[PDB]
Amino acid sequence: ERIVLVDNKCKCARITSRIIRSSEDPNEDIVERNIRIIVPLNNRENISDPTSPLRTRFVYHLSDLCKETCYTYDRNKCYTAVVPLVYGGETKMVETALTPDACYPD
Amino acid sequence: IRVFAIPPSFASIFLTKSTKLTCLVTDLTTYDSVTISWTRQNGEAVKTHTNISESHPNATFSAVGEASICEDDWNSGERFTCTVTHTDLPSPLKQTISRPLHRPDVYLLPPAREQLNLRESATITCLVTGFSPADVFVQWMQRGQPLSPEKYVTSAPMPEPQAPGRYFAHSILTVSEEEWNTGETYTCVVAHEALPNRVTERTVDKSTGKPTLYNVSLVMSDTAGTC
Amino acid sequence: ESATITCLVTGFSPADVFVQWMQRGQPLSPEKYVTSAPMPEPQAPGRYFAHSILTVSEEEWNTGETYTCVVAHEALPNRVTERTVDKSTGKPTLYNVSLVMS
Amino acid sequence: VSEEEWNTGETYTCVVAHEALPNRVTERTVDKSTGKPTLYNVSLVM
Ligand SMILES: *[C@@H]1O[C@H](CO)[C@@H](O[C@@H]2O[C@H](CO)[C@@H](O)[C@H](O)[C@H]2NC(C)=O)[C@H](O)[C@H]1NC(C)=O
Ligand SMILES: *[C@@H]1O[C@H](CO)[C@@H](O)[C@H](O)[C@H]1NC(C)=O
Ligand SMILES: *[C@@H]1O[C@H](CO)[C@@H](O)[C@H](O)[C@H]1NC(C)=O
Ligand SMILES: *[C@@H]1O[C@H](CO)[C@@H](O)[C@H](O)[C@H]1NC(C)=O
């Protein structure tokens, strides 16, 4: 019964609006926005770069997300980085899987 | 024998997908099949008038040089002239028409709450402002079907005091108050020259608007990367 | 960029309407606001409607200002009817904020 | 007016007649919703 206007995945916002149906009377029925936004609370500022510090200031521009480095990982997409590896004198750069269940071989 | 040269409107070039470049001559003498030549710089003349006045009680013989030509022809803006060959007036009647941008700020307003309290009807207007020139097409969209011209009224554009070049036009949609309570999405559609798609689609309904209640709910979740 | 207030007037049958705009209880210059000519509605051929458009700066609208619109007509009970809005002229907009530390 | 009438929130406009008024008359409105300015309630659930 609620219309999901905007569902951005990185900001993990859920812009959805619902109307409570009133009784038999002139219309004063309440229109609501059922916005339910979720914080990671432990992710870093550069989501692709693992070597970033903790992000504390989360800026949620609600008008902007309707239509910028993004907050939480999405299981559909891959956020991957390259890490150096050494067996000796040689240095080899190998792509790594930052999050499971997203880039698993399917 | 009226000397008048009227061009088509830019609202008509999309509503009807046709243009007519005419020499509006009315109150002419009662002579059938008069020779009226409306020629441009290229030299092409309009077709003879058909399905038009031949005999009327008020003696207003309307001899109009209507012809179906390409809509892009007048967009190119070639100069059009009128030549009148009439037996009553040997001197030909000559008149020439010619044509000389801002993004159309077509923005939509919800009904007032006093309309809802009265319960008589509801009114919605599309504030078509900041567009130049006055040529604009205003249409209404509900339930995926174009509303009849009877239901809605679009006012003539007027000069804007803030910007002399830009004009504003308002058009109200008057509906029953019971109809607006149910969702019909009351889509607003407009057409203007300085617009990318030639159509800007605006929408107002009861679902979208100023809400009575706001519950913003955040969880300080620790399981991240799963949304 | 600006704040535009639409004064929607409907229901005058003699088709002669006159609209002013008053801010802070004092009349405003006629240049700022423009009133359209009357024309009838399709629902009621006898009645007519006209619109008054005032364009004002958005920052001034952010501050609490009256921007009262007044309509003068013979058929009115007192021949003068004034209506006003504000930045908070609508419903109180109850909040329902929830914060979770789970 | 009756107490129950005010809960229904009719307009109750007031007019005054005077020479010094530029319009010779002015209007004011008071309702049940003229106050209650943005009342909030915040739930902190663990
Ligand atoms: C930090 O975020 C920036 C984006 O603002 C990214 O830097 C570049 O991202 C592109 C696309 O992934 C890569 O092709 C470039 O190689 C990145 N730049 C560098 C210097 O590596 C990236 O997501 C983050 N930067 C780093 C260094 O990880
Ligand atoms: C917001 O309020 C409605 C009822 O008014 C409720 O059903 C809904 O669950 C609330 N939103 C959240 C996130 O709890
Ligand atoms: C919002 O108010 C509703 C009642 O309309 C209540 O059920 C709900 O729990 C409230 N939301 C909170 C406390 O987050
Ligand atoms: C918040 O306000 C609504 C509106 O009255 C109320 O129903 C709800 O129970 C309130 N919630 C809390 C936690 O106070």
Author numbering:
A (entry chain J): 3 to 69, 98 to 136
B (entry chain L): 345 to 444, 449 to 575
C (entry chain K): 468 to 569
D (entry chain H): 523 to 568
Task: Show me the paper's own sentences about this structure.
The predominant form of IgM is an asymmetrical pentamer, with five IgM monomers joined together by the joining chain (J-chain). In this work, we present the cryo-electron microscopy (cryo-EM) structures of VAR2CSA, TM284VAR1, DBLMSP, and DBLMSP2 complexed with human IgM core. The pIgR/SC-binding face of Fcμ–J is also targeted by the P. falciparum proteins, and the interactions between the P. falciparum proteins and Fcμ–J exclusively involve the Fcμ-Cμ4 domains, which is consistent with previous analyses.
Full-length DBLMSP protein is unstable and tends to form heterogeneous oligomers in solution. We further performed the cryo-EM study using DBLMSPDBL and determined the complex structure with Fcμ–J. Different from the DBL domains in VAR2CSA and TM284VAR1, DBLMSPDBL interacts intimately with Fcμ1A, Fcμ1B, and Fcμ2B using all three subdomains. In SD2, Asp229–Ile232 pack with the 525–530 helix in Cμ4Fcμ1B. Glu352, Asn356, and Arg357 in SD3 engage Cμ4Fcμ1A. Indeed, two DBLMSPDBL mutants, N169A/H173A/R174A (M1) and D229A/Y230A/Q231A (M2), do not bind to Fcμ–J. Interestingly, full-length DBLMSP, but not the monomeric DBLMSPDBL domain, interferes with IgM-mediated complement activation. DBLMSPDBL and DBLMSP2DBL bind to Fcμ1–Fcμ2 using all three subdomains; however, despite this overall similar binding pattern, each protein employs a distinct set of residues to bind these Fcμ molecules.
